[PDB]
C-alpha cells in the first residue's frame, strides 16, 4: 500500500535527475561554444576591417583612374610619405615638449602642496576651525578644477573642429553644406530655447524672471567683491615683480665679476697660507742644524786642545 507509492516517486525523481544532468552537459557544451565564438568574433572583426580596406583601395583607384596614372599616384604618395616623416618628427617634438610642461606642472603642484601643509599645520596649532578651512578649500579647488577641465575640453573641441573645417574645404559642395548645417544647429538651439519659453504661463514666466533678477543682483554683488579682491592681489603681484627685478639689478654687469675677483683673491691667499706651515717647520730644522754645526766647530777646536 506504500510500495506502489515508492515506485512512481522514485521514477519521477530519477527522471528529473536525468533532466538535470542533461542540462549540466548542455551548460558545458554552451561554455565551450561561447569560448569558440569569442575567438571567431575577434577573427571576423579583423577580417572585416581588412575587407573594408581593400574595398577603399579599389574605390580610390576608381576615383584616380580617370585623371591620374599609376606613376603620378605613386609620386603623390611618396611626396606625402616624406612629408609625413617630417611631420612625424614635429609631432614627436610636441610630445616631448608637452611631457616636459606636464612634469613642470607636477613639480609646481607638489611645491604648493608643501606650503599648504605648513600653513594648515600653523592654523591647526593656533586652534582655529581647521575642518572648515580644509572643507571650503577642497570645495574651492574642486570647482576650479571643474572649470579648468571644461575649458580644456572646449579648446580641444574647437581645435579639432578647425581640422574638420579644413577637410571640408576640399569640396566646395560640402563646404557650403557645412556652413548651412552650422545654421541648422543654431536654429535648432533657438527653437529649443523659444519652445522652452512659450511652454510656460506668462504669470509663471514673470515669476521666474523676478527670481532671476534677484539672483542676478546677488551675483553682481559677489562679483564686485571679487573685482576688488583681485585688484588687491594684482597690486601685490606688481610690487613683487618690481621688487624682484630690482633684486635682479644687483647681479647685472660688473657686480658678478667683482665678487668673482674677490673670490680669486681669497683662494690665492689661502693657497699661500697653506704653503706657509711646512716650509716654516723645514726652515726651523735647518736653523737648528746650523747652530748644531756651531757647537760642532767649537767643541772640535776645544777637543784639539784637551
Amino acid at each position: 500500500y506504500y510500495i506502489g507509492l515508492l515506485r512512481p516517486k522514485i521514477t519521477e525523481l530519477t527522471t528529473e535527475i536525468e533532466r538535470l544532468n542533461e542540462q549540466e552537459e548542455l551548460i558545458v557544451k554552451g561554455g565551450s561554444v561561447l569560448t569558440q565564438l569569442q575567438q571567431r568574433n575577434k577573427a571576423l572583426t579583423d577580417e572585416a576591417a581588412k575587407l573594408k580596406g581593400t574595398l577603399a583601395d579599389i574605390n580610390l583607384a576608381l576615383e584616380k583612374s580617370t585623371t591620374q596614372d599609376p606613376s603620378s599616384v605613386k609620386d603623390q604618395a611618396t611626396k606625402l610619405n616624406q612629408v609625413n616623416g617630417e611631420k612625424r618628427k614635429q609631432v614627436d617634438q610636441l610630445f616631448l615638449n608637452a611631457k616636459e610642461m606636464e612634469a613642470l606642472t607636477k613639480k609646481n603642484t607638489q611645491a604648493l602642496e608643501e606650503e599648504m601643509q605648513n600653513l594648515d599645520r600653523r592654523i591647526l596649532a593656533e586652534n582655529q576651525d581647521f575642518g572648515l578651512y580644509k572643507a571650503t578649500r577642497d570645495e574651492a579647488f574642486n570647482v576650479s578644477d571643474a572649470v579648468l577641465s571644461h575649458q580644456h575640453q572646449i579648446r580641444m573641441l574647437t581645435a579639432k573642429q578647425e581640422l574638420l573645417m579644413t577637410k571640408l574645404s576640399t569640396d566646395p559642395d560640402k563646404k557650403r553644406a557645412a556652413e548651412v548645417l552650422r545654421g541648422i544647429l543654431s536654429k535648432r538651439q533657438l527653437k529649443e530655447e523659444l519652445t522652452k519659453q512659450c511652454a510656460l504661463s506668462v504669470e509663471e514666466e514673470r515669476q521666474l524672471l523676478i527670481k532671476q533678477v534677484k539672483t542676478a543682483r546677488g551675483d553682481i554683488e559677489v562679483l564686485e567683491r571679487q573685482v576688488n579682491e583681485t585688484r588687491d592681489a594684482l597690486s601685490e603681484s606688481k610690487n613683487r615683480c618690481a621688487s624682484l627685478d630690482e633684486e635682479l639689478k644687483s647681479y647685472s654687469g660688473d657686480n658678478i665679476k667683482a665678487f668673482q675677483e674677490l673670490q680669486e683673491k681669497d683662494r690665492e691667499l689661502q693657497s699661500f697660507m697653506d704653503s706657509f706651515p711646512a716650509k716654516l717647520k723645514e726652515e726651523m730644522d735647518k736653523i737648528t742644524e746650523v747652530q748644531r754645526n756651531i757647537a760642532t766647530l767649537l767643541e772640535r777646536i776645544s777637543q784639539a786642545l784637551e
Partner: protein, 432 residues
Amino acid sequence: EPSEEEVLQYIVDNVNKLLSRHYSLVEFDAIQGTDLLQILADIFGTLSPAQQIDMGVAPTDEAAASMLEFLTKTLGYRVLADSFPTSFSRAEPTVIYPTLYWVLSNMQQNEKRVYLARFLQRLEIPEAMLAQDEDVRALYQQYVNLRGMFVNTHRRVDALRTAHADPADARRAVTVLEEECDRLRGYIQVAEKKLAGVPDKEALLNACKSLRAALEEESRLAEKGVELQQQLISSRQRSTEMHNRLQNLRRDAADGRVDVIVRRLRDEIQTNKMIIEEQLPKELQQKQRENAEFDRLISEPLDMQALTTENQQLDEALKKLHQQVKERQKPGEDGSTIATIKQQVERVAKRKVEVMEQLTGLQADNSRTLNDIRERENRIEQLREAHHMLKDDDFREFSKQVLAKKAATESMRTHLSEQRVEYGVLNFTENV
C-alpha cells in the same frame, strides 16, 4: 511604503504581464468576488498545474481554504491570525491585494519553492512495515539516497547554470559579422569588377593603396599634433592656476583669520559656480554636437536636400515661435506688458556681464604678472646657483675676512723673516 495607488498599479501591471491580459485600472478594480479569487488562482496556475481551478463552478469555501494552504505552506507567507482565513474566504481586497503584491513580487522564489515542494517532501512513514520486510526498506533506502543525489546534482547544476552566461547575444553578433563580411566581399566583387578595364590594373591599385595609407597617416598625425598642442596649453594653464593658488595661500596666511579666508573662498567658489553650473556645460555640449555633426557629415555622403528642408522647416517654425512670443507681450488686463520685466532683466544682465568681464580681465593680468614673477624668481635662482655671490653685509664680512687673511700672511711672513735673521746670526756665530 507604497500607497494603495502604487500597489494597485503594481498589481495590475504584473497581473497583465504574467497572464498576458490588458486590464485597465478601473477594470481590475472592478474585479471583486470569486472572480478576484480566480485571478489569484490563475497566478498560482502559472506556478503549479495542480492549482488550476475554475472558481466559477467550485465549492468556494473549500477551494479558497485549499488556496490559502498553498499560499501559506508551499509559497511561505503568513500574517490578524483569526480574521485572515475568514476574510480571505471573502474576496476582501484589504487582504487580497497585499497577497497579490507579495506573490507578484517574489515570483522567482515561488518558482523555486514549488519545484522543491514537488520533489523533496511528503514522506513521514513510521518504520513498522519498514521493519517488517527489508525489501521495501531497501527500496526506501534507494529513494532517500536518490534524494541525496538530487540535492547534490541540483545545487551543483544551479550554481553552474547561473555561473555560465547565455551565448544568445554572442551568436547574434557573430552571425551579424558573418553577414557583414559577406556583404563586404560582394561590394568588393562589384568594385574589382568595375576596375577590370583600367589601363594598368595592379599598378594603379598598388599606387592607390599606398596613397591611401599615406592619407590616413597624414590625418592621424594632424590629429595627434592638435591634441598634443592643446594638452600642452592646458598643462601650462594648470601651472598658472597653481601659481594663483600659491598667491592666495600667502595672502591667506597673512590673516590667520580662518573666518575671513572662508568668506573670500566662498565668494570665489560661487563666482566659479556661476560659469560651471550652466554656461560652460552648454558651450561644451554645443561644441561636442557641432563636431559630431561634422564627423557625420564627412563620414557619409551628402543629400543637401534633406538639410535644406530642415532649414526651411526651422525658418517657418521660428517664425511661429517669434510671433507667439510677441503676442505674449500683448498688454494684459492691467495694461502691464511682460516686456517691462524683460527690460529689467536685460539691464541687470548687461551689468553682470560687464562686471564679470572686468573681473576676468583683472584675473588675466594677475596671472600674467604672476607668471613673470616666476620667470624672475627662476633666473635669480639660476644665478644664485651658477655663482654664489653675496653683495650684502655678508659681502663686507667676507671682504673683512680676506683683508685679515692678507694681514695674517704678512705676519707669518715677518715671523719667518725673524727666524731667518736668527739663522743668519747663527751662521755668522759659526763663522768665528
